[PDB]
Write a protein that binds this ligand. Structure first.
Ligand SMILES: NC(=O)c1ccc[n+]([C@@H]2O[C@H](COP(=O)([O-])OP(=O)(O)OC[C@H]3O[C@@H](n4cnc5c(N)ncnc54)[C@H](O)[C@@H]3O)[C@@H](O)[C@H]2O)c1
Ligand SMILES: NC(=O)c1ccc[n+]([C@@H]2O[C@H](COP(=O)([O-])OP(=O)(O)OC[C@H]3O[C@@H](n4cnc5c(N)ncnc54)[C@H](O)[C@@H]3O)[C@@H](O)[C@H]2O)c1
Ligand SMILES: [Zn+2]
Ligand SMILES: [Zn+2]
Ligand SMILES: [Zn+2]
Ligand SMILES: [Zn+2]
Lengths: 352, 352
């Protein structure tokens, strides 16, 4: 009957169950009663690789949040009782960058489980700006609980922004390199947008898995090299009457190998969507961009305003969550983090 | 009294004066009586560096053509007597690529002085599709001869496409790296679009020159290093109340050094316009594109449909040709090529 969180006090140290009181809410704030919260490589980063959080410790992690607004500041009453997905990163909505369509670079953006207390908790206080309403009627009809669509935040929306930006359209070849986590939904969403998707990875189990979920062709990056990789996608395109131009290539590995591979796949009018982050440098013919009249598009998370469309893909069964999602009790946060670090998990963990 | 061309028979061999007959014209064809034709590094490439032309030798080079329609096929009568700029490269206008706004990668694009006989000639036969009409009243009022606007093709239009694509708008910092040829017009057009333009080069004469023609700041890349170069543009932006985000960086050097420098200048929301071509590979943190939500845009020449706007910049004196342009008699084609190879020219050569 008291709200509680599971907080990181220190990298590698045990998570601490800490009860708390919700205070006065500012005018634009709401309390969401967490249904579920996803476990991300970003979260494992903070905890196992000592990546600095913006908020000082102790801090409840978790940015992949669904739940219900149970409490609201003065200008947020309209949200009470509505089931929501919380945006993983929330722009101001009011500054010249936000208002000119550059929300992804708001100097005042807030990420639960980094900037503020996160969603590994019964309850989490968040701004009401960009909350994504969930139709529970449609949720039920898709055979899903509110906790399941928690991972729509970041895991679905991030690749959704990448694909929208890239302008995937029917007849396209799409290539996604690294087809775990973000990448897997990159394949599913590219496919929903009309592309014939080539999936590339080092793990033949994720390749096998994506065969059933929108990957019309799969290639192991350990087996097939650069020169052959181009020929094999050219082959796929020719054999299926698909575009030899305007390839939509999503780099979702976050490794220099992946980036080098993806850049090598550029052709006339191609879009390379850079989604994965590495500090590794890469050797590339930058001028190929001019030679092919191609573009490389970075993507920093996703504007909230696209969350409802990403959700509609799930609700209208145009993609699958359920096969990539496993609910766990929040009190297992310790065992789950350990399991996910040791790559012993195949589905994305949701804590309840 | 016979039409003639100056043809490349063989790389490095003398140019040959060859007279010719214009036959019956197909329905969409016109003869333009050349007023002037620009001499480009592309032309020096074909002649001095043995770059393959698509049309077999012997071939009249020259793709930077202005002149007058003196003769027209049956469906092109309306063009007779009209002063024109010939597009350096003419897409089909009928293919899925041309019809979906990807004309720059049409596979059936025709370039005078490469695919067909060029403009180092009294006369050149070209399609009527994409011809840019020249207002002679406005031409006169800008203090220009028809021969002067020959270099609007490629030299102006190429950077014009790069700037339009990059979405330069008032409040922007623009950086152009390599401020000769294409680069110089990149500075002039960025500036006309409302940016405060930083010019970067290794030649202090072109820097001095661009100070007078839209470069609000100049930096010698031999004197100022990478780290300091960023600080100095940050300084320019802070001191002038300019955007510290969404920088429009145009790489116009066609050298790995320039590319490495330009990529290093990326910031939140930045556009890197890749205009220069080198075969050199470069080492870059590709993920900076995701971290800054930035984009790299290649540019292969320019859609004809934008030639009128490029010309309007010249006619309305919003940019300067005259200070960068020198007419020569076509019969000097030999002496001029030699002079331009030996870097002995400061203005762009037009042959008459
Ligand atoms: N752009 C954003 O806003 C954003 C948000 C979340 C994730 N990311 C980044 O995306 C990257 C991956 O995200 P994730 O959580 O899905 O990771 P993940 O570990 O779940 O998936 C990465 C996949 O890449 C595969 N892989 C590794 N090396 C490869 C190679 N050379 N070729 C092909 N596949 C290869 C792995 O086997 C794995 O399936 C990270 O760098 C992460 O930080 C960025
Ligand atoms: N994208 C297209 O469609 C298109 C069309 C025309 C030209 N180009 C390319 O544009 C490039 C330049 O053509 P141009 O006629 O303008 O060449 P240019 O020789 O007239 O100009 C190049 C400029 O780069 C400067 N420079 C050289 N090294 C530099 C460095 N490290 N840092 C900064 N500046 C440096 C030079 O001093 C010079 O001013 C070439 O690579 C050419 O092939 C492409
Ligand atoms: Zn996440
Ligand atoms: Zn904002
Ligand atoms: Zn040219
Ligand atoms: Zn065409």
């Amino acid at each position: 009957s008291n709200p509680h969180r599971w907080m990181m006090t220190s990298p590698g140290a045990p998570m601490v169950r800490a009860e708390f009181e919700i205070g006065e809410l500012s005018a634009d704030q709401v309390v969401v009663a967490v249904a579920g919260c996803g476990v991300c490589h970003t979260d494992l980063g903070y905890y196992y690789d000592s990546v600095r959080t913006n908020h000082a410790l102790p801090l409840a992690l978790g940015h992949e949040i669904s739940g219900r607004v149970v409490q609201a500041g003065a200008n947020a009453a309209q949200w009470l009782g509505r089931a929501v997905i919380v945006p993983a990163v929330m722009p101001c909505g009011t500054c010249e960058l936000c208002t000119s369509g550059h929300g992804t670079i708001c100097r005042d953006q807030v990420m639960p489980g980094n900037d503020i207390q996160g969603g590994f908790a019964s309850h989490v206080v968040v701004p009401a700006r960009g909350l994504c309403p969930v139709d529970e009627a449609r949720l039920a009809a898709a055979g899903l609980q509110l906790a399941d669509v928690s991972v729509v935040a970041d895991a679905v929306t991030t690749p959704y922004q990448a694909v929208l930006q890239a302008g995937v359209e029917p007849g396209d070849v799409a290539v996604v390199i690294g087809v775990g986590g973000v990448g897997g939904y990159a394949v599913q969403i590219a496919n929903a947008f009309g592309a014939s998707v080539v999936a590339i990875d080092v793990d033949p189990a994720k390749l096998e898995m994506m065969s059933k979920h929108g990957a019309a062709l799969t290639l192991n990056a350990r087996e097939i090299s650069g020169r052959d990789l181009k020929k094999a996608i050219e082959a796929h395109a020719k054999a299926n009457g698909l575009r030899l131009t305007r390839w939509k290539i999503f780099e979702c590995s976050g490794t220099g190998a992946g980036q080098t591979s993806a850049y090598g796949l550029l052709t006339h009018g191609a879009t390379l969507a850079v989604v994965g982050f590495t500090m590794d440098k890469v050797e590339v013919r930058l001028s190929n961009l001019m030679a092919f009249h191609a573009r490389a598009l970075g993507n920093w998370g996703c504007l909230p305003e696209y969350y409802p469309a990403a959700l509609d893909l799930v609700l209208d069964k145009k993609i699958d969550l359920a096969s990539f999602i496993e609910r766990h009790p929040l009190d297992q946060i310790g065992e789950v983090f350990a399991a996910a670090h040791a790559h012993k998990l195949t589905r994305r963990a949701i804590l309840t």
